[PDB]
Amino acid sequence: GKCRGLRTARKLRNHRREQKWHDKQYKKAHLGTALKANPFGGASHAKGIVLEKVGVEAKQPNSAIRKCVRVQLIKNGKKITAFVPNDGCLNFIEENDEVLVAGFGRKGHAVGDIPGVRFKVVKVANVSLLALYKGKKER
Amino acid sequence: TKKRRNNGRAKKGRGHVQPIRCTNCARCVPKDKAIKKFVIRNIVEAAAVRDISEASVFDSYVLPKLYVKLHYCVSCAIHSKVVRNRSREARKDRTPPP
Amino acid sequence: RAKWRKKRMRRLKRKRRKMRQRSK
Amino acid sequence: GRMHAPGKGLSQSALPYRRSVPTWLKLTSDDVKEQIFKLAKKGLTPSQIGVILRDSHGVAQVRFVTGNKILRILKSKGLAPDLPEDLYHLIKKAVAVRKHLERNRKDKDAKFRLILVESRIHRLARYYKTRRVLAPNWKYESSTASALV
Amino acid sequence: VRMNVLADALKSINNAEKRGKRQVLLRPCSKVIVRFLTVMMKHGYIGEFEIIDDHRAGKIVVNLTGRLNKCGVISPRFDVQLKDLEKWQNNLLPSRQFGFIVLTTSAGIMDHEEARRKHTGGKILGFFF
RNA sequence: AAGACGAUCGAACUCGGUCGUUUAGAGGAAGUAAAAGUCGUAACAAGGUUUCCGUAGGUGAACCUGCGGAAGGAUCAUUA
RNA sequence: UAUCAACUUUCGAUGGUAGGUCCGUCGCCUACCAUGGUGACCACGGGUGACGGGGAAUCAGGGUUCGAUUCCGGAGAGGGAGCCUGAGAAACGGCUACCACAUCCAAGGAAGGCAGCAGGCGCGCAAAUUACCCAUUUCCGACACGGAGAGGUAGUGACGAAAAAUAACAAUGAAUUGGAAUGAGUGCAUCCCAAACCCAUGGGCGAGGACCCAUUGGAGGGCAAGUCUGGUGCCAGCAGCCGCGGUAAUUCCAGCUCCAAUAGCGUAUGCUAACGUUGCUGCAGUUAAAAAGCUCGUAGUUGGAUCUCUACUUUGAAAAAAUUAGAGUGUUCAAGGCAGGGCCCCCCAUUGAAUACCCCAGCUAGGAAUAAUGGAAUAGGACCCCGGGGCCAUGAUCGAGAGGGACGGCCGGGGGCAUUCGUAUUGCGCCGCUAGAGGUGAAAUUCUUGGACCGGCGCAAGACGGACCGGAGCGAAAGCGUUUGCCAAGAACGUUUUCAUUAAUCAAGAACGAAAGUCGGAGGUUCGAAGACGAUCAGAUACCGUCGUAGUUCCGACCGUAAACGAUGCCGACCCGCGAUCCGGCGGCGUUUGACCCGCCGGGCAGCGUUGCGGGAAACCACGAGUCUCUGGGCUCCGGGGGGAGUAUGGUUGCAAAGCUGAAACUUAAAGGAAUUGACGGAAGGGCACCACCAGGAGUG
Ligand SMILES: [Zn+2]
């Protein structure tokens, strides 16, 4: 059990500090890993250049083709697979364009039936993808 | 889930017992966990005691008995219908069947 | 079975040391 | 329970409430001290002296007939041994076990008991050094202990 | 071994109370226990008790009135100031209307209300309600 | 005033050592995902050889076998 | 942060002495000596997307996180180093060098430092005018006068915070009607302000779809809000999660409608509460992730009762403001400000511009409970007398249903050594008879007229210790069963014996530790990994059978692993009942030559009734898994969704096999615990029909 001694503040402080590393949520934010492997490097959004136009298939029991894009970031040159959210917005995307990608819902976790996509496109050609979908800023 | 309070054997305050071997399969089973069955039967079955009595050279000769100590493992004791499964509450009865 | 998965890992990391000790 | 073994047995003495000598005990304080001195000279530990006085002389408690305990009576006169009786018997046992352990080499039970006894020797001697009963340089050596018993 | 004999005293009382007993025997006697049982008795939680005095630690036999819900100790025995006393009342006492926290101050072993009137703090022994 | 023997502070360069962090690699060997493929049926009903555990060997594969142990067994019980 | 356990000390590390040097103290430095100094209470080394603090965010209480940022202190002006002047600098809007970078050039040379205010480039998800004035705030100077990108005022600005329009009021059954009401805006005066700008005060324009139009996300559930309509048809797409789309979609694409907040709102990533899923308050470890195999052992933590009935606690002193809390006060209210109120050239309201908090440590004055600690024991100990005397009640708390030790009679498959015996098993010898014998579901391999199997006689070898043998004993566990002897040890009980707290649990350490395995010898009966062969099968390197190597046994030395299990750490307290059992002790009435019978006490292995006074998700638990929201006896180890994975790497140990220590990228929405119902079983028991069978009749194919 616990040591309730009046001079056990050192034993309690050392035990609690060590057991916090067995927490998955704590060891992820207080280590070099999970941040060096993070392509964004701890940022909210990121800009990149579109390399290809790949379509990943949704996992079971779903059946569809997710319109994704192979993007290479600028600040570190890493290759990520963003997601073009809305309907037909992949046509607004052209290869070798400047797109502002961001996270996808869950932090560093694949959202929905998409196999390994954990990012999504926010802007393209320095204009927002949402305005292109609503008939504004025709680009 | 724990099926038996005695863990299917009779060992209280010990760490290891001498393992004995079964009779019809020769499997190493602990001495306390084995299902023992002391069968005491005459050498001559009831179908031939009369024929031996007529062929006996004595006047009053009691036929001997055959003392056989049988040790059955749990697998063979159930297969040979020596023991059977019982209800969850009927398992606690330790009195042998009359 | 779980005891054979442990037996494979023992035989897997045993040959890993062979191909690692031979390169030194 | 015990210190180096399991068991919660309570087998000890139960001293009475009356801290007074009975009326049928005519031995005065001087007579009891003379009996202790005669028994202490012939090599009887304070534990053994109190047993004889209790079972043959009716002295239920030497602490009641006199004003001091048996060891303090010997310490005042100067008949107390160099090392205490309890520490002497622990070393006596360790030498007997070690002498048995050097002949019988593969008795892991005796080797296990030798660690238990030597652990009690070091903690009992540590208490005596704090009470200044033993010199600070005192140390139990497994080789030179046989000459102390 | 037997440490904090006050805990073994209040645990024996709390158990014997829930069993419906009328008298409980406490094996080790102490002045800290008597000062604790006196505060519980002055507020009408326990009756009279005879301090059985043998030539040893001594035993106590306490009468029970059926009015006690639970009596316990605070094992680390923290140092309670006059400002932090309000925090201990909310956590330990089941209501602001009854229940007491027996403290140990320089003026003697007493409850928390008397420590407020005498304007003094100290260490905390336990509670009863 | 230039200039110069010398002692101290000491930048900097070069070549070693050490520490920390990115990265290429024939070939080798795993994990995971997609598993809508092939072979067998190891496990779950005594899963058709009860399951398992430690150790060791063997075998296309799951696995098989020897030794001791466990019931989380398929027996809380078998009669002088 | 231990995957950093020893570090410092030739070449100053710790100290001593003499001196040098400095404004002055000092290994600050030099010279001679000393061998020290720090560390498990974490030194040293490494990491920091570390300037410290006043503070900030969020909070029921505790806490968690943040603090480059206007206040204080420190540090640096591209990187280091050196110096000049001066009261003050190791200054860079001073200087001299080298390094990097860079400017002009008649190619000889010269010159440079925006982490100052604007501005440019680069970098990025990410951050404003190459503006005005020294009028306010203050500073500097020979000075009332000069200067100040310090500062102030505008510009940019949805970082945010406060106030607050987008209508109000009446008849008639609505882009119907009707007159009223001030703003937005727009100019013109005044005010404002160094000039301007903004606000405010007026008057002139200024609303009827008061066209002077409110967006941003949703409408299956969580979660307030459509069985609407059209389109698409597992496509396109939606969806944080569960899911939706498979031609009649409340979830997609749109129309209409509705809901929520509102000049805002959605999203992404951090952070806090949610989270009692890091649990000091306040979590768990039988079966869901979990107590080391076991014991010993120092640091550490925690320690019985007992005497007048320096930690703690209280007070005071001291403390930068701002911030926070908070008193007063109608900036039109408010965020805020520290000002301003009342009377006919003043006066009154001492006009106000409070007060609280400021951990810990240090300082001060009280209290004396609780927790440590010291005092007289080989006394010259305290007081006197005045080296000898006098004197004190002359000075030792209790022995714990704490512990150690002793002693007494016992008890036990406890351990070591030696000895004895027992039948079996295999082999061998002789004799008898005889042709099969072995084995299997059935057979075969194998062994057989050179005599197998079977009977009798007795010889050798190595294992093993059946039955008795038990929900019995002992041991710290692993483990332990023939007789007898020897050696040492142990629990319990008994005691009016002794010591007098010596204790409990315990990091890094240490002993022991089944089976298998490794090394060197001895041995090798049975069994038997591997292997060979004979079956079985679609195949069968398996299950079955016949032979059989390493092993299995002993000695010495390693490995330190198990479903090492009660899947339940150790010590202590309280807490139900009953009948047995083993050991010691006590008492009682007989029977039998100690045995047996009936109770009591202590300890131990367990059981039943508890329908458990209680606990828990059940199952189940009185060797507690009870006395935890009415949450606190002490302590150690240890768990944090499932996989990757006990894997990679590093350290360490080992002859090796491997042990201990031990991640991450990535992947996943479940995995799992207990119980219920049903289905199923080459599981058991009990029953029923020719759409089943036995015995048969007709056939059919
Ligand atoms: Zn069997």
PDB file of N, CA and C in Angstrom, chain D residues 74-118:
ATOM      1  N   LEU D  74      25.129  -8.716  40.259  1.00  0.00           N
ATOM      2  CA  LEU D  74      26.442  -9.199  39.849  1.00  0.00           C
ATOM      3  C   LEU D  74      27.309  -8.076  39.298  1.00  0.00           C
ATOM      4  N   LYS D  75      26.699  -7.089  38.637  1.00  0.00           N
ATOM      5  CA  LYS D  75      27.476  -5.984  38.088  1.00  0.00           C
ATOM      6  C   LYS D  75      28.041  -5.104  39.195  1.00  0.00           C
ATOM      7  N   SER D  76      27.294  -4.938  40.288  1.00  0.00           N
ATOM      8  CA  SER D  76      27.786  -4.145  41.408  1.00  0.00           C
ATOM      9  C   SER D  76      28.936  -4.851  42.115  1.00  0.00           C
ATOM     10  N   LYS D  77      28.774  -6.145  42.398  1.00  0.00           N
ATOM     11  CA  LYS D  77      29.843  -6.901  43.038  1.00  0.00           C
ATOM     12  C   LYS D  77      31.011  -7.137  42.090  1.00  0.00           C
ATOM     13  N   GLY D  78      30.740  -7.242  40.796  1.00  0.00           N
ATOM     14  CA  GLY D  78      31.771  -7.505  39.817  1.00  0.00           C
ATOM     15  C   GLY D  78      31.818  -8.921  39.290  1.00  0.00           C
ATOM     16  N   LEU D  79      30.718  -9.666  39.376  1.00  0.00           N
ATOM     17  CA  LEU D  79      30.665 -11.043  38.908  1.00  0.00           C
ATOM     18  C   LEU D  79      29.971 -11.185  37.562  1.00  0.00           C
ATOM     19  N   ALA D  80      29.592 -10.080  36.930  1.00  0.00           N
ATOM     20  CA  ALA D  80      28.949 -10.157  35.630  1.00  0.00           C
ATOM     21  C   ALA D  80      29.965 -10.566  34.566  1.00  0.00           C
ATOM     22  N   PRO D  81      29.573 -11.400  33.607  1.00  0.00           N
ATOM     23  CA  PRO D  81      30.511 -11.816  32.559  1.00  0.00           C
ATOM     24  C   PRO D  81      30.853 -10.660  31.632  1.00  0.00           C
ATOM     25  N   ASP D  82      31.894 -10.879  30.827  1.00  0.00           N
ATOM     26  CA  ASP D  82      32.334  -9.853  29.887  1.00  0.00           C
ATOM     27  C   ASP D  82      31.253  -9.557  28.853  1.00  0.00           C
ATOM     28  N   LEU D  83      30.777 -10.588  28.163  1.00  0.00           N
ATOM     29  CA  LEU D  83      29.702 -10.408  27.203  1.00  0.00           C
ATOM     30  C   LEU D  83      28.383 -10.905  27.784  1.00  0.00           C
ATOM     31  N   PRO D  84      27.265 -10.291  27.400  1.00  0.00           N
ATOM     32  CA  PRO D  84      25.969 -10.693  27.959  1.00  0.00           C
ATOM     33  C   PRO D  84      25.638 -12.145  27.641  1.00  0.00           C
ATOM     34  N   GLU D  85      24.683 -12.684  28.402  1.00  0.00           N
ATOM     35  CA  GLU D  85      24.338 -14.095  28.264  1.00  0.00           C
ATOM     36  C   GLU D  85      23.646 -14.377  26.935  1.00  0.00           C
ATOM     37  N   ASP D  86      22.733 -13.497  26.516  1.00  0.00           N
ATOM     38  CA  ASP D  86      22.008 -13.727  25.271  1.00  0.00           C
ATOM     39  C   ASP D  86      22.935 -13.650  24.066  1.00  0.00           C
ATOM     40  N   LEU D  87      23.856 -12.685  24.062  1.00  0.00           N
ATOM     41  CA  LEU D  87      24.818 -12.593  22.970  1.00  0.00           C
ATOM     42  C   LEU D  87      25.820 -13.739  23.011  1.00  0.00           C
ATOM     43  N   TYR D  88      26.098 -14.273  24.202  1.00  0.00           N
ATOM     44  CA  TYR D  88      27.031 -15.389  24.312  1.00  0.00           C
ATOM     45  C   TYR D  88      26.434 -16.668  23.741  1.00  0.00           C
ATOM     46  N   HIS D  89      25.131 -16.879  23.934  1.00  0.00           N
ATOM     47  CA  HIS D  89      24.500 -18.098  23.444  1.00  0.00           C
ATOM     48  C   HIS D  89      24.236 -18.051  21.944  1.00  0.00           C
ATOM     49  N   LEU D  90      24.072 -16.857  21.373  1.00  0.00           N
ATOM     50  CA  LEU D  90      23.940 -16.755  19.923  1.00  0.00           C
ATOM     51  C   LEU D  90      25.255 -17.081  19.228  1.00  0.00           C
ATOM     52  N   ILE D  91      26.374 -16.610  19.782  1.00  0.00           N
ATOM     53  CA  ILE D  91      27.678 -16.945  19.220  1.00  0.00           C
ATOM     54  C   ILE D  91      27.990 -18.417  19.449  1.00  0.00           C
ATOM     55  N   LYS D  92      27.594 -18.954  20.607  1.00  0.00           N
ATOM     56  CA  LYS D  92      27.792 -20.376  20.873  1.00  0.00           C
ATOM     57  C   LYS D  92      27.081 -21.235  19.837  1.00  0.00           C
ATOM     58  N   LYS D  93      25.886 -20.815  19.414  1.00  0.00           N
ATOM     59  CA  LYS D  93      25.147 -21.578  18.415  1.00  0.00           C
ATOM     60  C   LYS D  93      25.772 -21.435  17.033  1.00  0.00           C
ATOM     61  N   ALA D  94      26.254 -20.237  16.696  1.00  0.00           N
ATOM     62  CA  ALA D  94      26.847 -20.021  15.381  1.00  0.00           C
ATOM     63  C   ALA D  94      28.118 -20.842  15.203  1.00  0.00           C
ATOM     64  N   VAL D  95      28.910 -20.989  16.265  1.00  0.00           N
ATOM     65  CA  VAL D  95      30.104 -21.822  16.183  1.00  0.00           C
ATOM     66  C   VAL D  95      29.720 -23.286  16.013  1.00  0.00           C
ATOM     67  N   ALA D  96      28.662 -23.724  16.698  1.00  0.00           N
ATOM     68  CA  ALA D  96      28.220 -25.109  16.573  1.00  0.00           C
ATOM     69  C   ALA D  96      27.677 -25.395  15.179  1.00  0.00           C
ATOM     70  N   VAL D  97      26.954 -24.439  14.593  1.00  0.00           N
ATOM     71  CA  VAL D  97      26.455 -24.617  13.233  1.00  0.00           C
ATOM     72  C   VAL D  97      27.604 -24.591  12.235  1.00  0.00           C
ATOM     73  N   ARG D  98      28.524 -23.636  12.389  1.00  0.00           N
ATOM     74  CA  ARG D  98      29.644 -23.528  11.459  1.00  0.00           C
ATOM     75  C   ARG D  98      30.555 -24.745  11.547  1.00  0.00           C
ATOM     76  N   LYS D  99      30.749 -25.284  12.753  1.00  0.00           N
ATOM     77  CA  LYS D  99      31.522 -26.514  12.892  1.00  0.00           C
ATOM     78  C   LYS D  99      30.813 -27.683  12.222  1.00  0.00           C
ATOM     79  N   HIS D 100      29.480 -27.696  12.272  1.00  0.00           N
ATOM     80  CA  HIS D 100      28.722 -28.719  11.563  1.00  0.00           C
ATOM     81  C   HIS D 100      28.701 -28.458  10.064  1.00  0.00           C
ATOM     82  N   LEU D 101      28.797 -27.191   9.659  1.00  0.00           N
ATOM     83  CA  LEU D 101      28.722 -26.845   8.245  1.00  0.00           C
ATOM     84  C   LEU D 101      30.022 -27.137   7.508  1.00  0.00           C
ATOM     85  N   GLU D 102      31.158 -27.123   8.207  1.00  0.00           N
ATOM     86  CA  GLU D 102      32.427 -27.420   7.555  1.00  0.00           C
ATOM     87  C   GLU D 102      32.658 -28.914   7.375  1.00  0.00           C
ATOM     88  N   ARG D 103      31.982 -29.755   8.158  1.00  0.00           N
ATOM     89  CA  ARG D 103      32.027 -31.198   7.952  1.00  0.00           C
ATOM     90  C   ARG D 103      31.003 -31.629   6.906  1.00  0.00           C
ATOM     91  N   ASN D 104      29.738 -31.279   7.121  1.00  0.00           N
ATOM     92  CA  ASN D 104      28.676 -31.533   6.154  1.00  0.00           C
ATOM     93  C   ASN D 104      28.603 -30.338   5.212  1.00  0.00           C
ATOM     94  N   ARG D 105      29.062 -30.527   3.977  1.00  0.00           N
ATOM     95  CA  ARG D 105      29.190 -29.420   3.038  1.00  0.00           C
ATOM     96  C   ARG D 105      27.899 -29.113   2.292  1.00  0.00           C
ATOM     97  N   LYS D 106      27.046 -30.110   2.069  1.00  0.00           N
ATOM     98  CA  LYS D 106      25.860 -29.956   1.233  1.00  0.00           C
ATOM     99  C   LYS D 106      24.568 -30.050   2.041  1.00  0.00           C
ATOM    100  N   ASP D 107      24.555 -29.455   3.230  1.00  0.00           N
ATOM    101  CA  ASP D 107      23.341 -29.316   4.033  1.00  0.00           C
ATOM    102  C   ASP D 107      22.920 -27.850   3.953  1.00  0.00           C
ATOM    103  N   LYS D 108      22.132 -27.526   2.927  1.00  0.00           N
ATOM    104  CA  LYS D 108      21.730 -26.143   2.702  1.00  0.00           C
ATOM    105  C   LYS D 108      20.822 -25.614   3.805  1.00  0.00           C
ATOM    106  N   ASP D 109      20.235 -26.497   4.615  1.00  0.00           N
ATOM    107  CA  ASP D 109      19.437 -26.036   5.746  1.00  0.00           C
ATOM    108  C   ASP D 109      20.324 -25.446   6.835  1.00  0.00           C
ATOM    109  N   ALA D 110      21.445 -26.105   7.139  1.00  0.00           N
ATOM    110  CA  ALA D 110      22.357 -25.585   8.151  1.00  0.00           C
ATOM    111  C   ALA D 110      23.014 -24.292   7.689  1.00  0.00           C
ATOM    112  N   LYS D 111      23.337 -24.197   6.398  1.00  0.00           N
ATOM    113  CA  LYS D 111      23.875 -22.952   5.861  1.00  0.00           C
ATOM    114  C   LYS D 111      22.850 -21.829   5.929  1.00  0.00           C
ATOM    115  N   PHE D 112      21.565 -22.159   5.790  1.00  0.00           N
ATOM    116  CA  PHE D 112      20.520 -21.149   5.905  1.00  0.00           C
ATOM    117  C   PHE D 112      20.357 -20.687   7.348  1.00  0.00           C
ATOM    118  N   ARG D 113      20.492 -21.606   8.308  1.00  0.00           N
ATOM    119  CA  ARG D 113      20.376 -21.228   9.712  1.00  0.00           C
ATOM    120  C   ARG D 113      21.556 -20.382  10.166  1.00  0.00           C
ATOM    121  N   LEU D 114      22.748 -20.641   9.624  1.00  0.00           N
ATOM    122  CA  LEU D 114      23.917 -19.851   9.999  1.00  0.00           C
ATOM    123  C   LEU D 114      23.738 -18.385   9.635  1.00  0.00           C
ATOM    124  N   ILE D 115      23.019 -18.102   8.549  1.00  0.00           N
ATOM    125  CA  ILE D 115      22.738 -16.717   8.187  1.00  0.00           C
ATOM    126  C   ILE D 115      21.737 -16.106   9.159  1.00  0.00           C
ATOM    127  N   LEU D 116      20.771 -16.902   9.623  1.00  0.00           N
ATOM    128  CA  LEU D 116      19.779 -16.391  10.564  1.00  0.00           C
ATOM    129  C   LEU D 116      20.411 -16.053  11.908  1.00  0.00           C
ATOM    130  N   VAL D 117      21.305 -16.913  12.399  1.00  0.00           N
ATOM    131  CA  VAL D 117      21.926 -16.678  13.698  1.00  0.00           C
ATOM    132  C   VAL D 117      22.874 -15.489  13.626  1.00  0.00           C
ATOM    133  N   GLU D 118      23.704 -15.433  12.581  1.00  0.00           N
ATOM    134  CA  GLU D 118      24.636 -14.319  12.440  1.00  0.00           C
ATOM    135  C   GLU D 118      23.908 -13.000  12.228  1.00  0.00           C
TER     136      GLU D 118
END
